[PDB]
Design a binder for this molecule. Structure first.
Ligand SMILES: Clc1ccc(Cc2nnn[n-]2)cc1
Ligand SMILES: [Zn+2]
Length: 257
């Protein structure tokens, strides 16, 4: 029964999930002046040409677009990563207003939303196994700022009223996640965690420097979703973001000078 409210939100999660106060928790503030350019970071390889999207689901915390990860169809490699990481799903975190929503912050700036493209290390064979490993997942985080519409997000936006409430899903085949990327693949990387329970410390975070622009109308539609299931009182799905957590003994590395 965790969520994002006063009574079940992030400040409460440590009671059920004491790793909440662990040593490699996410998200973090990315201090752009303290992150170090790491000349040894291989270039990042996002190969999504063959991606097979399937379904879009409101799970009561976010909306998830799910992909067929039974084969190496959409993968992430290179940059900080060893081996191959297979795309399983993406989702967003967003705010009730344009000035908040992202999980990661950049010199304390909050963006309106944050996209997470979630990949698991194929050497651990399934996702469940991967989340039990320090290098189990690689999450590609991309900030959303409000400006001009993002055309490759609109198929997402346009379908949301079919999954208004928790537990609703719809067919979402033939969606190409490459349309959600910015131009540049410059990134920050650091070792961290899931930003939701169970908060496992199993993520290599890769956060793109260049945000994508989305329109106000686009993000507005995210905010019309519901945390609640159908035929319950309406709690709008907003502010599903965890605030920034202590960096502790970690370094954020930059791929760019
Ligand atoms: Cl499959 C999956 C993985 C992580 C999350 C939530 C999250 N953890 N870190 N960023 N988002 C939701 C679904
Ligand atoms: Zn997320």
């Amino acid at each position: 029964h965790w969520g994002y409210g006063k009574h079940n939100g992030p400040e409460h999660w440590h009671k059920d999930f004491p790793i909440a106060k662990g040593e490699r928790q996410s998200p973090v503030d990315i201090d752009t002046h303290t992150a170090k350019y790491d000349p040894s970071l291989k270039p990042l390889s996002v190969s999504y040409d063959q991606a097979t999207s399937l379904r879009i689901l409101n799970n009561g915390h976010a909306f998830n677009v799910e992909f067929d990860d039974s084969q190496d169809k959409a993968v992430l490699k290179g940059g900080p990563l060893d081996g191959t990481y297979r795309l399983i799903q993406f989702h967003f975190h967003w705010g009730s207003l344009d000035g908040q929503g992202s999980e990661h912050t950049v010199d304390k700036k909050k963006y309106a939303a944050e996209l997470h493209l979630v990949h698991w290390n194929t050497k651990y064979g399934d996702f469940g196994k991967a989340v039990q490993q320090p290098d189990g997942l690689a999450v590609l985080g991309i900030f959303l700022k409000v400006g001009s519409a993002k055309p490759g997000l609109q198929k997402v936006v346009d379908v949301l009223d079919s999954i208004k409430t928790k537990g609703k899903s719809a067919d979402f085949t033939n969606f190409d996640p490459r349309g959600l990327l910015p131009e540049s693949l410059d990134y920050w990387t650091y070792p961290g965690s899931l930003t939701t329970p169970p908060l496992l410390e199993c993520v290599t975070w890769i956060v793109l420097k260049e945000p994508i622009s989305v329109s106000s109308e686009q993000v507005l539609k995210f905010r019309k979703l519901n945390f609640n299931g159908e035929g319950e009182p309406e709690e709008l799905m907003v502010d599903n973001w965890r605030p920034a957590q202590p960096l502790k003994n970690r370094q954020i590395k930059a791929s760019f000078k």
